Amino acid sequence: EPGDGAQTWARFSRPPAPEAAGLFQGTFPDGFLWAVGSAAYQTEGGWQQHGKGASIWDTFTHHPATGDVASDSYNNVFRDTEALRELGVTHYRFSISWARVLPNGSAGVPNREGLRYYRRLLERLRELGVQPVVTLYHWDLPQRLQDAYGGWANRALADHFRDYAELCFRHFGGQVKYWITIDNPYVVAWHGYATGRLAPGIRGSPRLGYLVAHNLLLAHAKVWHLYNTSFRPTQGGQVSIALSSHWINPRRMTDHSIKECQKSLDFVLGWFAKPVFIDGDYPESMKNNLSSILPDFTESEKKFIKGTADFFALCFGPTLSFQLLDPHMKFRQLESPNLRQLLSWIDLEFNHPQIFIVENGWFVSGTTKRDDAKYMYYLKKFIMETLKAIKLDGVDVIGYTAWSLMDGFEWHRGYSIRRGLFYVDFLSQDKMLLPKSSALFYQKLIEKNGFPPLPENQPLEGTFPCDFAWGVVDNYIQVAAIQPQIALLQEMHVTHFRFSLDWALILPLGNQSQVNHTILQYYRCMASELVRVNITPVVALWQPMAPNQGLPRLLARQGAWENPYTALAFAEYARLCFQELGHHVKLWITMNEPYTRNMTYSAGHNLLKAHALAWHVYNEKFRHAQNGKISIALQADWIEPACPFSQKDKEVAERVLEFDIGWLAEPIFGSGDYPWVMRDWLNQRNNFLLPYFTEDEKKLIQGTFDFLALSHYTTILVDSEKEDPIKYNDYLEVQEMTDITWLNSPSQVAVVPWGLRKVLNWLKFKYGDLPMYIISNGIDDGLHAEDDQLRVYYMQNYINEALKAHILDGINLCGYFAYSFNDRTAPRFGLYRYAADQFEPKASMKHYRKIIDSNGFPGP
Amino acid sequence: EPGDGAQTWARFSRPPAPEAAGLFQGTFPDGFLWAVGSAAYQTEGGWQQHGKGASIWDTFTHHPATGDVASDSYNNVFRDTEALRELGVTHYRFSISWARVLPNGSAGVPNREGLRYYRRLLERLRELGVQPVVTLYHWDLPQRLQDAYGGWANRALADHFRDYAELCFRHFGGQVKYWITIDNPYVVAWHGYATGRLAPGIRGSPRLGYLVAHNLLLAHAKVWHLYNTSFRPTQGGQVSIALSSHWINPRRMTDHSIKECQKSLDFVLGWFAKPVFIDGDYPESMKNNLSSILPDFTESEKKFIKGTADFFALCFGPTLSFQLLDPHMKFRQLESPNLRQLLSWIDLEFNHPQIFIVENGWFVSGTTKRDDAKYMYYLKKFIMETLKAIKLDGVDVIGYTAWSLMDGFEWHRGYSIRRGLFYVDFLSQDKMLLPKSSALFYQKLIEKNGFPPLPENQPLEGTFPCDFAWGVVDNYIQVAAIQPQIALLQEMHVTHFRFSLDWALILPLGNQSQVNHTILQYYRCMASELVRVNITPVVALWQPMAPNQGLPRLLARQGAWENPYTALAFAEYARLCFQELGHHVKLWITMNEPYTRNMTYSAGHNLLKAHALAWHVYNEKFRHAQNGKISIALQADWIEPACPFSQKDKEVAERVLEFDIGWLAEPIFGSGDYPWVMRDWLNQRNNFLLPYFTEDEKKLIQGTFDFLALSHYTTILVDSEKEDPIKYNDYLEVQEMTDITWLNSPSQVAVVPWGLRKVLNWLKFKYGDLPMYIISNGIDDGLHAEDDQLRVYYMQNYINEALKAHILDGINLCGYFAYSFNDRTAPRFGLYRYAADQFEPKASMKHYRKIIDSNGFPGP
């Protein structure tokens, strides 16, 4: 019964857990259908072939690119279904244009050519094992039924949509098991007639829109009561109607605002859904706020229209979300693309019918041809939401469909949009299809029945090797204050508290003829006491976050790092740090994670030289009398290929790594000079400022690394083809992307458990087996009802995946250090919160404690 | 008699010689007055002090910044005249506002306070030896005489300007020897009333403008016939009226066009000048084209107005040139600021009266405070034109005046423009004056009575030292063709013909595994034959003018000069040039004059390295078996300080030199590293990409210079304060300027004889005594009636000044060279012209020949 939908915004304004919000596991139950979509003018092409009737869009495209040459699907059954066999999908959704068989203004002579076409297609689908989802209308109209009957304003056309739909049953037979009569009545009514953005009409008032919608909904009642009285006795499939429906969230979360949102949903979705499943009447709000421009039913058709459906077919995507949609219907509410709460609302408001999503998917621009990760990740998110509705919301779904099997013409966005699963170029006369990324992803999602648990996606028990390192990070410690620090570290079970010094504060002028020994003796006492409380400090020396790159004013004014002499300015300062503190350290970090897409190359040369001098110094003068190791902590945020089976993604991933990680790693770790692909790309693109290495420099840099502090915060995705003008970095020809289905942060930084294990394996595949630390890893707050529900997942899964690397691959770890043990020096990122001048343990910190005292997952 | 002015545009459309066009010498005859200017409402300030009457400006400024606090000259006689004593000027021009003594609408009670002020000022001027030039009106009007008499539309105000001008004689006595009654009647009429850009009125038609002008000219007749009948029997001084007058050149130089220009001159200047000196009638053109909106005289006043002046006072400058001026009066002709031909026209059209220029000078913007070279050079040009009119045009001038002794509120314009000779800041309560550059220049121009011949500005005879080098330049020689070349060189008496190779053409790919030996053997034959005809070729190796900096395509695509390896790519190519041609050369140039404000620093490092490698190569492997010298030819266009007595100009000159000349000279010539001031400015401004020198690099670069080829084309001027948004180079905080009084070129490149001697002395003061060549020096065509009249001056004076350096300073020269021995490879710059596929000797080439065969000026 209506009204209970008000609980949907409540029930999905408070996520019970991120576990269920993501739903990284689970499978679709036995008998969950899968289909792929296609429209009657997106992909068919041709206007007079073999006797085709003219479309209203044939009339529309001529003067506001065309469908007289649209993808070539009217003559060949094998080419299209080759894509299907590659997909292995159980079902295939398409349409039938009305003008094709009956073009006249009286439903004249049927043309047998399209009939043989569709019989061949259905027979092929039978052979390969594909069942159809036919749609007797997709934004079409026979022109001769338009210039005489005034379009869908007049009633008689519902009679036509009766008879032509009866023959639609008789011509295609009984193997057509699922049916959808009117596809998206809302746009065809309003934007078809009122605004004129869709084919018919040029302009009108909302009166025409409401009348067209009334007439279409009556035509649906006609065709339903046709099927249920004349054809079903020899049948047993279902029939429904697809109602397109976006979803909105309120503005200020108030009762009036939720009322406005319910009103908008009824005005876009409820508009036809209410008198089909519930009572046979238009909604109360359209009765009230629309005074007399909304045609009302009589008691005979009030009953004639009720109950005329079996399952609920739902249409979703870019058709009327963030796209063509009456701005007066949103009633000043936020449009947002979510399908889980939407499915829950549709299931609650209609006495629990079964749901079938008959159109879903996003769009990629007209310039991208083969690699379109936008569509893959939107489809993955949509299937995730459908599964979460099946499992966590009790929305009994019967199947899912992905839209635009074949590229085409998005009506208003004309040809400037490409949506197909299979790329077709507009320069080929065969219109030859080629597989894309989306097709491969859908293939590997079908055959595995959703997202089944995988060896990597399933926790494998195991213990950590002894002497494993532990600790946490505060790279901004304020320099009395030591006792609460050590109390919070020892309380956290920390053995290697990570911090730095902010060198700029060590030396006011950058010279060692003067020093403010206060902070120096403070660090001395700090390290010493930490050892008395048994903490060996992971120490850093230089930080990347500063308006002057973190140098003293005098050392910054003279070319902070571009200058040659600054390298020695680092060197001697290192000697300082190693001659005073040199006893209480067992691990050092000189250049603590410099950023790698804004720092100039020539300065990078001097940074590597500085590292070389510092290492040679602490080796040839202090290592023998003071034990220890000294190496680098380099930024190694994993770059994954968007298409895991495309080569150009692999190459661009290599390049962006060699500029992020390899740029400051290849002379330190490997051969001793820059990576190959970075210099190849500098030279081939005729853009270059990099220095080269001289033999003395090469022998200076190479071979100084005693450990490897991989720094991994999140995982980013690369794409090779331009899709956006502002965010496709031309210099590297790189398009940065973040997947949408992952659990995200309130600051939009992704959590991916399996990332680390990859960047680990890579960094062994490249620089040989060696003791590896994971030095930086920590997400911020999340899900502001309990700020720990995401960091518990974060740690629980990242450390597990690290164990997984340590067990299944042989990547010899040494330790792990989560980031930001507090918020006061790290907004939103802490473990202990800072509230009212006090540090307070949040639950994820307790989870950390459990793992640390367990020293890894307690084995069998 | 009128009409003879048509010969002025002819007589000054053909310059008889540049000698007289510049007039670098000459002095003002005995009894040539000098004065300085000041307005009545730009520098005085105050509106009610001691009983001052309100101005029409006081009413104007309130709503279209003010003169209620304008410079403080109403209470203090010593502060203003301190500037005068610093100036030592014989005379001082100022004004008297009308409202000050008489503010009423009936010429009411006189106020004795301004009277004591002006008596004190006149007594001080008497003591210091300063005589006045009083002006009884400058744009003013008493308000009570405006709101009752309708401003200068009505006649009675000329009666007022009668009586108030009589008292103006009686109150100030007889020591007031020169008088000007109405200052600039044209603007006060038209822009005072018609447009309303000047104080009175808000809007009107040209009718009001013509009526106001008629009334002002009648008031001038009244005051003149007052003076000549009542006061002169006891006062022998003169009286006149200042008529402001711009000057125009025709568009297409046609009889109708000269008629239009004469018409415009009569409509702006002749408007009042014709009925004062000639006949007592308005001009014929204003009678014809102005039908009935121009009040005509009667026969009684026709005679009353004639002959009412003694000398002609002329007003010139930014008042109505390129500024406030009726756009309908130019009759579509070009406004241009020349005063010589203007003075000639005024002298020809008025039966030869004596002329006095009572307002002249340009303006500098509101942001510049102390260094304003614009005003110095405009004043120098104006005095040059006045002298040229005295000497070459028979315009008997009686004196000159410079405008705006004190900065201040510009009628219409506003404080926006600073024009004073003495800077006054608008934050000081004393309004304390400070000297400027213009004041010092005027001081040193007065005491020397114009431009008297100076030891540097007077040719001093002398012979050149034997074995002095000779030759000319063609850096673009096309690679038979040799015989006319050598015939034209030997014909010119050339011993060291300067040329280059265009290295990019030597090697197609930049590798010496392949070479097009055609041009190489052509150069071989060329040098050899030149030696047979006794020419030792000054050879160059690399040219700056190219879209790829002159490298082969392959050597350009890979970082032409930023790359390290390109240095060796130069090195070996040098070895090539030295191993084949190595016999027939006695002077080399590797990096022939690279530009020094667009070439990147990092590439400059590699250029210096290339020079070092090439020099060490040709020294350690070829110098012993093949004699010769190899050095650099560096761009050393002299930078002169705009203010020869200001220090900041000196510092910015040093800096722009060290970046132009010193940048590629200090590591080669001097200490071996970059200049001090350039690195100090890179570091203090926190903008820096320069490299530093490593000890091996320092020992590589330093000490390889065997001669010094100073390249001096022209002389540019620097200024330190911003004056223009687009042409004040912020990075160096440098404002580039070219003096306006010099002879220029049709391509605007200055000729300055004394330049070379300066850049010579400097380059000895900096890099020690050493054999110096002047390798590139020449100008293009000029004065298109005979294209040689400027190059003869050019050579005749540049080589003289070089001799002067060789005699008076000890700058050991070796050999001079002029540029562009032909035009075909040097547009407009040649000596032999290229006309109809033929080389033809122009006269300046013959002058060159005379000097060369004379081998310097034949001594006593």
UniProtKB/Swiss-Prot annotation, chains A, B:
Variant or mutagenesis effect after changing residue 297 to V: In allele KL-VS
Post-translational modification summary for this protein: N-glycosylated.
Entry's Gene Ontology cellular component terms: apical plasma membrane; extracellular exosome; extracellular region; extracellular space; membrane; plasma membrane
Substitution effect: residue 138 to R: In HFTC3; impairs the ability to form a ternary complex with FGF23 and FGFR1c; impairs KL-dependent FGF23 signaling
EC number from the UniProt entry: 3.2.1.31
GO terms, biological process: calcium ion homeostasis; carbohydrate metabolic process; determination of adult lifespan; energy reserve metabolic process; fibroblast growth factor receptor signaling pathway; negative regulation of systemic arterial blood pressure; norepinephrine biosynthetic process; positive regulation of bone mineralization
Catalytic reactions of this protein: a beta-D-glucuronoside + H2O = D-glucuronate + an alcohol
Family recorded in the similarity comment: Belongs to the glycosyl hydrolase 1 family. Klotho subfamily.
Other notes: Defects in KL may be a cause of chronic renal failure complications.
Protein name per UniProt: Klotho
Gene symbol of the encoding locus: KL
